[PDB]
Amino acid sequence: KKFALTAEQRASFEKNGFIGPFDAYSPEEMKETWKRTRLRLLDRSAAAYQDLDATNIANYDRHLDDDFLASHICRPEICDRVESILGPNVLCWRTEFFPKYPGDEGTDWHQADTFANASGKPQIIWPENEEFGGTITVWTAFTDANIANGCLQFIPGTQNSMNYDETKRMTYEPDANNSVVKDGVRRGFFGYDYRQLQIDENWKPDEASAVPMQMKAGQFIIFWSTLMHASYPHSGESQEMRMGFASRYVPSFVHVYPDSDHIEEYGGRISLEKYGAVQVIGDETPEYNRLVTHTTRGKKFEAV
């Protein structure tokens, strides 16, 4: 397809666990789009999750209500590259906004396979006979992302070995988890401390090997959720906030929210009544995955 990964790009992705950044929009187009979208998003009247029983869950699945985000997850610039990795039938099962306000703590080092990390209950389950896990995350810079405003960082080549155990639980305590200094860096996990999930209490991330991923507004980066990733803190030197938008993809055979009609995490609880996965690539998915074809405002999931 037109934006497929090259063979060299595919080799690099396999080695490093991330590939890009690539362009979805020009910086000028992204700036204007984000200006309008940020305002529109303040209206939650069509959101799939009405009652939040609050939470970071307020950032989830706005593609299910928003015209632009419904187009974005389907962008061929994104989907052709996801297809190179995930094959002919692929769902977007989750989206999340990741703001860093001026002064915010960096995102903790983490890896996720099942996404039971915060809730204690798996959200995606791959075939049990196989060795695959996690989700392909496409993280789009809705603003510029630089080290000073909290850009992402990765430890290359760590996507094939988990350092955390998502059957351990971590406690939600925002109070306590605010700019906790960890190996010289203010970091947290949206009210949790991801170190609580470490397989070995005394192990530490190989932060000396971390590399930054600075991006311009309109770019995206592709990485496995099993890759060691984090963000820098936002120093507040800029008075402009950083915004990333994550779209998460799995092959359609992966079980999405098995045995669940609600999720409880990040200090909130939501119903999955108006949730569905979106088929962004191909036209076959097993019956066990609930799909939607349109937003809650009747906009088709297709790139415009």
Ligand X SMILES: CCCCCCCCCC(=O)OC[C@H]1O[C@@](CO)(O[C@H]2O[C@@H](OC)[C@@H](O)[C@H](O)[C@@H]2O)[C@@H](O)[C@@H]1O
Ligand Y SMILES: O=C(O)CCC(=O)C(=O)O
Contact residues toward ligand X (CB under 6 A) are 86-88, 131-134, 159-160, 224, 226, 251
Q: How far apart are CA 64 and CA 298, in angstroms?
A: 10
**Residues facing 219 on adjacent strands:** 23
Residue 30-69 contact track with ligand Y, rule CB under 6 A, x = bound: ----------------------------------------
What is the per-residue DSSP string for 231-269?
Answer: E--B-SSSSSPEEEEEEEEEETTSEESTT-SEEEETTEE
Considering only the stretches 32-40, 67-75, 197-205, 223-231, report the one whose residues sit in contact with ligand Y under the rule CB under 6 A: 223-231
Indicate which of Br ion, ligand X, ligand Y, none lies near residue 302 (CB less than 5 to 8 Å, by partner kind): none
**DSSP H helical ranges for 73-173:** 76-86
Nearer to Br ion, 25 or 224 (CB): 224
Amino acid identity at 128: E
CA distance 216 to 218: 6
Is 189 a binder of ligand Y (CB under 6 A)?
no
Q: Which is nearer to ligand Y, 90 or 241 (CB)?
A: 241
Q: Is residue 231 a contact point for ligand Y (CB under 6 A)?
A: yes
d(CA 252, CA 166): 22
Site string for Br ion, 97-126 (x = CB under 5 A): ---------------x--------------
> Packing angle between helix 76-86 and helix 7-16, nearest 10 degrees?
70
List the single partner that 251 binds among ligand X, ligand Y, Br ion, none, CB under 5 to 8 Å by kind. Answer: ligand X
Site string for ligand Y, 117-156 (x = CB under 6 A): --------------------x-x-----------------
DSSP string, 66-78: -HHHHHHTT-HHH
Identified binder of ligand Y from the candidate list 107, 119, 247, 252, rule CB under 6 A: 107
**CB neighbour list of residue 42: distance below 8 Å, 6 or more residues apart:** none
Q: Which residues bind Br ion (CB under 5 A)?
A: 112, 155, 158, 205-206, 225, 228
